[PDB]
Amino acid sequence: SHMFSKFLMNVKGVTPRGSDWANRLGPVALFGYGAGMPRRAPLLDFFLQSPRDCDHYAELTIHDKGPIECPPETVMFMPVLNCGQMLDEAAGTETPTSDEWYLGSLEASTELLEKGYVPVSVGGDGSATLSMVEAYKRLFPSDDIVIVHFSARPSVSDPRSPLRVLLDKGLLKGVVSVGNRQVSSEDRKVRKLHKMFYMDMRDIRNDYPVFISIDASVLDPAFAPAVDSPVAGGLSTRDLLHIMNGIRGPKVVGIDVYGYNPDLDVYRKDNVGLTAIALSKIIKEGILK
Amino acid sequence: SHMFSKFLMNVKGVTPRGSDWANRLGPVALFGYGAGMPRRAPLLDFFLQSPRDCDHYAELTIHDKGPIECPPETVMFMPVLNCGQMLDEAAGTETPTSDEWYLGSLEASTELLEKGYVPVSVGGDGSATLSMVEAYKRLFPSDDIVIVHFSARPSVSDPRSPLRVLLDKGLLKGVVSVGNRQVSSEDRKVRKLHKMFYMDMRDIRNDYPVFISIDASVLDPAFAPAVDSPVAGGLSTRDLLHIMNGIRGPKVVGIDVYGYNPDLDVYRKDNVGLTAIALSKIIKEGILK
Amino acid sequence: SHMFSKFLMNVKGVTPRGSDWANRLGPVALFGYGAGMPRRAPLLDFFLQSPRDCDHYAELTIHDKGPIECPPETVMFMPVLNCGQMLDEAAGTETPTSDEWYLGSLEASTELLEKGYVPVSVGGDGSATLSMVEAYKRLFPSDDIVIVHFSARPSVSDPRSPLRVLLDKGLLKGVVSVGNRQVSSEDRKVRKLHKMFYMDMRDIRNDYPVFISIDASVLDPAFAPAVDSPVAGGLSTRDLLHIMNGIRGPKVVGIDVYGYNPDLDVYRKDNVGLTAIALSKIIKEGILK
């Protein structure tokens, strides 16, 4: 798409992660992804205006240009690179197709992963799980990639769905699905047939690189109302942050936080979305690692 | 009332539960009850448009005509009969009185119970607890009926209130009141005087037929804002679903889910009520048995 | 301020607590405090229209004139004196300054504490923590005052902030900060330097007089959306009520419930604020002691 051109022109030329990072986790690179959601994507911009003070005793630090410097030892920063929104809000109305959102997301993730940033794609419908993990396996076909998937639904009955696509491509050496509460016979047959683990409503303890995929639908509609067909009986924001805290790994391959649609949110009297508040926290503590 | 005529004409002629059910639980028969709430009652209709996929590994199946067939053994369906709304939305504006809502609810429940459907009355103010359990004791005066009551208040200080009426009629061999957090000296005197059990904010393990009465007021106002004088410090939707899961019995005599008023709800930006979402789940997993 | 004149004229002449109270806890004296929030302060008035039935088996009793009588032994009442709003809604538009809000709050608290009422200041931004505990130490400089502080932030990095001011004045023999989830390096340095205890997201067991300071920001934005920069991952209303229940002491020096701003709230379809509902409960069970 001509829409991503300016995003694309930007992702390429970011000064690579240097030798300041030796056997070091990070850095993180952030962008806004808008597939399957309305044309206006705040949330990213809402996350950038949010407190930098984390739940745990580390602090986010946001940079637009490179190179960026590594913190030392015991004093914790968390330097995050803002690549901004995929969609240029000033270069047309020609909104991309699923192939265009994908090819770009694949190209961004690839160009973020090449440089040693941990990619984090925020917004959209969850399609940016497929592309980002596929950029990783392209780069590192030797690395075993697993996925920790948080949603109200397994999101696997449909062959188009991004986890179903990965499983069948044998890119996934395993799927951990957490929070599921809308399970059909389609989801349960595909479950024991691809031997994945699940926890419907301690330590993960693995040496396998973790992709983290977070559907806002996993929370309760009370905390995250801004989803398609919201599913009650869900997680509190704190419930997710707890379980998220306990994810183990040698490294995170990437993070896709999706499912949020401004039009479906419950709003304060000053026009702030409950789901924006909730998810803005979720992204923060997803970066903290 | 002339309003129920079409509902009444309909409840009578439903093809009875057959020999497909031998020593079998169910089937379920659904209707919408509107006493003490505005004339428009969605929720029923909102429940019918909701996902059929339960929290637990069974699936609801909704039929308008009879007879319906019984599932086999290990593969779980949950066939539910839609009797629709009491109030015909096209036969007048003459909204019934408390005697009319009662006489009908009594007549529906009686005509649902005669045929071996487990009645489930959705909407209203909780008056459809009194009528439905009284249709049961009319049919089965030998059967001991207990009630598991979920509300923010005991709803017993007032002699008009539907549990207070049953207790004094000695139809109730016991009351389990769960979730209470607005208790007056009126409620507490009537408590130790009618020796009922309560749990204000494991297994029930009884052989006594269970009526299940669910006031949306039992949840938190965060999850179920759509109630008269909402009471904070309440249940999450998941909290109720847990405690509900643990109800024991030889059979359920019926289920009344009430307390919901569209006018009092908090709404998403697309006009969906938080309480509708919450309660639509509650009814589902109330049928699952 | 000329605004408080009518409030001031009123606080002075309240008939003192008599000999009906001998080695007795209470009574309580209530007023509405509006510092740092819009000119309209409902909440107080919303609390007065709320159910008197507590979570625990005691009942609030609200009196406007004095003297009031003490309950006997095992039968529990909780007689609370309504001093109304600081700001007279009919004597000008000249809204006070931070010195005026303070001098008055200091004068009210002093004139409430002199007479043996436990002061409870409802509304505002939390400034009514500083004044009320300083009226206490003026009266009783011998008494060791500690504070149990509930907020999303430690509220101590800023030298203007009311707990930071007390600590440095050595009025505080200790600070218990509960619920914190936005902690900067400013908050953490000031923490181990003033040796206070904290619990970010059994019995307190102390003989030290307790001030209770409650920022609505401590709850989750799902339960209490009506705060400045709301912080997700918070307490449920029930979570706070539990932890609040477990506060120990020889006496409470006072209670400031703040952080609520009508303009920032999520509202039902009938214009009731979720935060009003939540906080109206919080004040109730804060008085119960």
Tell whether B182 lies on the interface with C, counting CB pairs under 8 A: yes
* Contact criterion met (CB < 8 Å) for A281 and C226: no
Are B281 and A182 in contact (CB < 8 Å)? no
- What is the torsional sign of CA B152, B154, B160, B165? positive
Residue C197: closest CA among C180, C209, C211, C184: C180
Q: How far is CA B60 from CA B80, B213, C100, in A?
A: 7, 20, 64
Are the beta carbons of C41 and C121 closer than 8 angstroms? Answer: no
For residue B285, give the nearest of B24, B65, B59, B129 by alpha carbon.
B59
Separation of alpha carbons B255 and B263, rounded Å? 24
Contacts of C181 in chain A (CB under 8 A): 55
In contact, A40 and A20? CB cutoff 8 Å: no
Q: Given an 8 Å threshold on Cβ–Cβ distance, is B237 in contact with A234?
A: yes
Residue A271: closest CA among chain B residues belongs to which residue? B269
Task: Identify the CA nearest to B109 among candidates B98, B93, B120, B95.
Answer: B120
Residue whose pair of structure tokens reads 């909402």 in the numeric block: B230
Which long-range contacts (C-beta less than 8 Å, at least 24 apart) are formed by B106-111? B106/B131, B106/B132, B106/B134, B106/B135, B107/B8, B107/B11, B107/B135, B108/B7, B108/B8, B108/B11, B108/B31, B108/B83, B109/B134, B109/B135, B109/B136, B109/B254, B110/B135, B110/B138, B110/B139, B111/B11, B111/B12
Q: Which of B49, B55, B56, B220 to mutate to test the interface with A (most CBs of A within 10 A)?
A: B55
Do C281 and B236 make contact, defined as CB atoms within 8 angstroms? Answer: no
Inter-chain contact C201–A269, Cβ cutoff 8 Å?
Answer: no
Q: Which two tokens stand for residue C264?
A: 């920032």
Continuous segment of H or E residues that includes residue A79: strand A77-85
Q: Residue A162: phi, psi to the nearest 5?
A: -70, -20
The answer to whether the CB atoms of B263 and C270 lie below 8 A apart is yes
CB B87 within 8 A of CB B106: no
End-to-end C-alpha distance for chain C, whole angstroms = 33
Q: CA B176 to CA B206: how far, in whole Å?
A: 12
Residue A67: exposure state from Cβ atoms within 10 A (0-12, 13-18, ≥19): middle
Neighbours of A195 (CB within 10 A): 8
Residue whose structure tokens are 């497929």: A130
Domain boundaries, chain A: 1-289
Q: Which residue of B233, B263, B266 is in closest CB contact with C241?
A: B233
Do C123 and C36 form a contact (C-beta atoms < 8 A)?
no
Residues in chain A: 289
Query: What's the CA gap between A58 and A121, in Å, rounded?
Result: 21
Residue of A nearest to C266 (CA): A268
Q: What is the CA radius of gyration of chain B?
A: 18
**Residues C29 and C117 sit within 8 Å (Cβ to Cβ):** yes
Give dist(CA C221, CA C225) in Å, integer. 4
Residue to test with chain B: of C277, C279, C288, most B Cβ within 10 A: C277
Q: Which two tokens stand for residue A71?
A: 């913190």
The two three-digit tokens of residue B238, written as one number:
């998941």
Residue B108's CB: how many other CB atoms inside 10 A? Answer: 27
Count the neighbouring beta carbons within 10 Å of the beta carbon of residue C68. 22
Please give the class, per CATH, of domain A1-289: alpha beta
Please spell the DSSP secondary structure of chain B, one letter per residue: --SSHHHHHHHHTSPPP-TT-SS----EEEEE--TTS-S---THHHHHSS--B-SSS-EEEEESSS--PPP-TTS-EEEEEEEEESS-TTS-S----HHHHHHHHHHHHHHHHTTT-EEEEESSSSGGGHHHHHHHHHH-SSSPEEEEEE-SS---SSTTSHHHHHHHTT-EEEEEEES-----HHHHHHHHHTT-EEE--------SPEEEEEEGGGB-TTT---SSS--SS-B-HHHHHHHHHT---S-EEEEEEE---GGG--B-TTS-BHHHHHHHHHHHHHH--
- Cβ distance of A232 and B277 shorter than 8 Å: yes
Out of B53, B222, B269, name the one closest to residue A222 (CB).
B222
Query: Which chain C residue shows the shortest CA-CA distance from B154?
Result: C53
Query: Are C220 and A238 in contact (CB < 8 Å)?
Result: yes
Do B226 and C268 lie within an 8 Å CB cutoff?
yes
Distances (CA, A) of A173 to A170, A224, A249, B79: 7, 30, 14, 39
Locate the chain B residue with the closest alpha carbon to A186. B53
Task: Answer yes or no: do B272 and A181 touch at CB < 8 A.
Answer: no
Two tokens at B77?
């369906």
State how far Cα C40 lies from the chain centre. Answer: 18
DSSP labels for A179-238?
S-----HHHHHHHHHTT-EEE--------SPEEEEEEGGGB-TTT---SSS--SS-B-HH
Compute φ and ψ for C192, nearest 5 degrees. Answer: -75, -5
Pick C269's closest partner by Cβ from B200, B233, B264: B264
Residue corresponding to tokens 């047959």:
A189
Is the sign of the CA dihedral C70, C71, C76, C79 positive or negative?
Answer: negative
- Long-range pairs, B102-106, Cβ under 8 A, ≥24: B102/B35, B102/B127, B102/B130, B102/B131, B104/B1, B104/B4, B104/B7, B104/B8, B105/B33, B105/B35, B105/B131, B105/B132, B106/B131, B106/B132, B106/B134, B106/B135
| C215 annotated to a ligand binding site | yes
By CB atoms closer than 10 A (0-12, 13-18, 19+), residue A178 is buried
Identify from A156, A183, A239 which residue to disrupt to test chain B contact, counting B C-beta atoms within 10 A and taking the largest count: A183
HEC assignment per residue over chain C: CCCCHHHHHHHHCCCCCCCCCCCCCCCEEEEECCCCCCCCCCCHHHHHCCCCECCCCCEEEEECCCCCCCCCCCCCEEEEEEEEECCCCCCCCCCCCHHHHHHHHHHHHHHHHCCCCEEEEECCCCHHHHHHHHHHHHHCCCCCEEEEEECCCCCCCCCCCHHHHHHHCCCEEEEEEECCCCCCHHHHHHHHHCCCEEECCCCCCCCCCEEEEEEHHHECCCCCCCCCCCCCCCECHHHHHHHHHCCCCCCEEEEEEECCCHHHCCECCCCCEHHHHHHHHHHHHHHCC
Which residues neighbour A49 within 8 Å (Cβ) at sequence distance 6 or greater?
Answer: none
How distant is the Cα of C139 from the closest Cα of chain A, in angstroms? 39
What are the angstrom distances between the C-alpha of B247 and each of A18, A157, A201, B244, C4? 60, 32, 18, 6, 56
Residue of A151, A155, A182 to mutate, testing the B interface (most B Cβ within 10 Å of its Cβ): A182
**Cα distances (angstroms) measured from residue B146 to each of B65, B137, B212, B280, B288:** 31, 11, 9, 25, 19
A189: which 2 tokens? 């047959």
Quick count: other Cβ atoms within 10 Å of Cβ B224?
A: 34
